[PDB]
Amino acid sequence: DIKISVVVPTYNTELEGLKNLMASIDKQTMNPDEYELVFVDDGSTTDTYERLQEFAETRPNMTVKQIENSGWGSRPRNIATKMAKGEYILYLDHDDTVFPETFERVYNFGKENNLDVVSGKEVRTNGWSWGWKQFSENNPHAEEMGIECLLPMTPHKFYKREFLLENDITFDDGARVLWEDVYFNSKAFIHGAKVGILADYPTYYWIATGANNSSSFGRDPHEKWNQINKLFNFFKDNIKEQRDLDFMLTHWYRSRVLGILGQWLLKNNNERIDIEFNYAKKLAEELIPAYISENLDKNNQVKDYLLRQGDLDSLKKLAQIDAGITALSYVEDAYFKEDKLFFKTSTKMTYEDKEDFFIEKTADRMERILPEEIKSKLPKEFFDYSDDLAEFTYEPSIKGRNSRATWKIDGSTSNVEVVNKKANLYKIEGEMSFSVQINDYILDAADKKQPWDIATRFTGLGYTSHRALTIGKILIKTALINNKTMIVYKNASGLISLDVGSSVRSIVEDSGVKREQILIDKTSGKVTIPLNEIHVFGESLIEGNAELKPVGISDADPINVKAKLIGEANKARVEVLLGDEKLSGEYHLVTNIQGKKDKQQIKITL
């Protein structure tokens, strides 16, 4: 009785990625006798099928089958679903990987709460978030929130196999379609799936390669909007719950239809803009009710209005007025305190991190700044930000540079003010203070030695700016906290990074060394090297080593000796143990804690 079936459609699969896929499944904490691997090759030209069988040689739970090419992943996933015998199915693409505890955590979460779909936290290579809303907390009763509980609607979730089979839930392969994972997840919810969200552990890594697509399907504007029309018609005809239908109509109208009416207009030729604008206008009139836009922000209500009027020229004019609106955060102070790293940051809305972004106070109204030729074409309520000045968000986030996983940094406090800069003009300014407990984000053992990058997420007046936290001054601060070496620093791009476990930087080199305070107890053979500036909390002992070379003998072998990085009584030191090495004269001394050597140029005389 198999707990999990891994459905993997392959087609001309790149060999290295296929090997990484196999290693990520082999390293599951779940016992191998309790999951199943089903690979369906979709008529590959490469030796992919031969290699899939070569992989299946060593695995009594991996099944491989070859069919002729179907042009997409829908057909192989459906056949593999009919071949599977596990309780839950994971649709794993041939270029992705899975985190090592995914199978065990997901199944126990699904079995305990009797879930039909488990939406586990998904990681993507690029970006500072993915599912920032939906992956914010575990929710075993997520389907009570509505169909939103399945976003983002990738197919990389865990589905109850008998639920799919009893409701005839398959990927649309009889027709050629984009967003097949959106159809698949919506059908799952329409038939009443009990959904749970597992957000406290990264379950799936969706990897950005360089060859994600090479087909003629979807690249032209006519096929694109044919697919968009088919998706909206699918919602209006199949979603029976009014709340769920309104969510899907609002979410997809805002992102894919109104989404071409902003900066997109500045990145495309007039021939393409004219084609897509007419399609979008026609869809709004034909499929999108007027009430959908009443629950949108002021800016999206402006785009919706001008779209239905065919006033593309005003939209182009608005795209240029809006070009560059953003909110970058600067570090006001960064310091360690007890076992945490503390930050104080500040931001404001600007054009491209330069002059201030402004709104106007006219009478009792807080208005968007527009030329009077634009304001004379719009309902006056659509550029009035009065009822929106308290809807600002300002939050920190972190991202592991190895795992690519992103997390919100909890416990932060912020405050956004609408301040009168000059005359009747108002700028928007934010301040925020937060701390980082690095253990919150260390889930796999690999996470203990990793660089982390800090970012801030600012939303308001309809704009969203999620950008790396930055600092102008040189920032280098080290800490030895409960056996964790930590270095917060301005990296070479001017952004804020945090190294933990000497992944990229040397804590001895960044702390400095009191050279004139080095002690040499030659009877015990112990060389003590006090570190200069370092925040030490708790007791630490990190084993490492060091290298000695006789000065002047430039070709000499390193003399390998043991070393210890010690934190105690809020001081840090490196102790080098000479041991049985007989030494006489001056020597270069280089410490090697956690695989990172210092550049302090230490010389001792023995």
Ligand X SMILES: O=c1ccn([C@@H]2O[C@H](COP(=O)(O)OP(=O)(O)O[C@H]3O[C@H](CO)[C@@H](O)[C@H](O)[C@H]3O)[C@@H](O)[C@H]2O)c(=O)[nH]1
Contact footprint for ligand X (CB under 6 A): 9-11, 42, 69, 71-73, 76, 93-95, 154-155, 181, 206, 212-213
Burial of 240 (0-12, 13-18, 19+ CB in 10 A): exposed
CB atoms within 10 A of CB 194: 18
Task: Tell me if 114 is assigned to a ligand binding site.
Answer: no
Interface with a copy of itself (CB under 8 A), residue total: 23
Q: Is residue 227 close enough to count as binding Cl ion by CB under 5 A?
A: no
Of residues 488, 341, 328, the one with CA closest to residue 394? 328
Of residues 424, 425, 426, the one with CA closest to residue 460? 426
Long-range contacts of 243-249 (CB under 8 A, 24+ apart): 243/146, 244/146, 244/147, 244/189, 246/292, 247/146, 247/147, 247/148, 248/147, 248/186, 249/288, 249/289, 249/292
Burial of 305 (0-12, 13-18, 19+ CB in 10 A): middle
Closer residue to Mg ion in complex, CB, 303/404: 404
Of residues 535, 539, 537, 529, the one with CA closest to residue 589? 529
Residue 206 interface partner, choices ligand X, Cl ion, a copy of itself, none, CB cut-off 5-8 Å depending on type: ligand X
Closer residue to Cl ion in complex, CB, 151/504: 504
Residue 491 interface partner, choices Mg ion, Cl ion, a copy of itself, none, CB cut-off 5-8 Å depending on type: Cl ion
CA dist 454 and 205 (Å) reads 20
Closer residue to ligand X in complex, CB, 130/201: 130
Q: What string of DSSP letters covers 133-148?
A: TTTSS-BTTGGGG-GG
C-alpha 580: how far from chain center:
50
Q: Is residue 274 close enough to count as binding a copy of itself by CB under 8 A?
A: no
Asked if 477 and 511 count as a contact pair (C-beta separation under 8 A), the reply is no
Residue 94 interface partner, choices Mg ion, Cl ion, ligand X, none, CB cut-off 5-8 Å depending on type: ligand X
Closer residue to a copy of itself in complex, CB, 38/328: 328
Asked if 203 and 105 count as a contact pair (C-beta separation under 8 A), the reply is yes
CA dist 170 and 366 (Å) reads 50
Interface with Mg ion (CB under 5 A), residue total: 2
Residue 9 interface partner, choices Mg ion, Cl ion, ligand X, none, CB cut-off 5-8 Å depending on type: ligand X
Q: Is residue 93 close enough to count as binding Mg ion by CB under 5 A?
A: yes
Residue 419: beta bridge partners? 427
Task: Tell me if 489 is assigned to a ligand binding site.
Answer: no
Choices 2-10, 131-139, 349-357, 520-528 (CB under 8 A): range interacting with a copy of itself:
349-357
The sign of the dihedral angle between the CA atoms of 593, 594, 595, 596 is: negative
Q: Residue 353 CB, nearest distance to a copy of itself (Å)? A: 7
Q: Residue 74 CB, nearest distance to Mg ion (Å)? A: 14
Task: Tell me if 77 is assigned to a ligand binding site.
Answer: yes
The CA–CA distances, whole Å, from 284 to 250, 288, 445 equal 11, 5, 50
Residue 331 interface partner, choices Mg ion, ligand X, a copy of itself, none, CB cut-off 5-8 Å depending on type: a copy of itself
Options 38, 398, 471, 486; binder of a copy of itself; rule CB under 8 A: 471
Residue 463 interface partner, choices Mg ion, Cl ion, ligand X, none, CB cut-off 5-8 Å depending on type: none
C-alpha 461: how far from chain center:
24
Closer residue to a copy of itself in complex, CB, 254/490: 490
Q: Is residue 95 close enough to count as binding Mg ion by CB under 5 A?
A: yes
Q: Considering only residues 490-509, where is the footprint of Cl ion by CB under 5 A? A: 491, 497, 504
Q: Residue 124 CB, nearest distance to Mg ion (Å)? A: 11
Q: Residue 39 CB, nearest distance to ligand X (Å)? A: 10
Residue 346 interface partner, choices a copy of itself, Cl ion, ligand X, none, CB cut-off 5-8 Å depending on type: a copy of itself
Query: Which element (helix H / strand E) includes 40?
Result: strand 35-42
Binding positions are 9, 11, 42, 69, 77, 93-96, 156, 180, 206, 212, 330, 353
- Return residues touching a copy of itself (CB under 8 A): 270, 320-321, 323-324, 328, 330-332, 346, 350-355, 470-474, 494, 601
Instruction: List residues binding Cl ion (CB under 5 A).
Output: 491, 497, 504
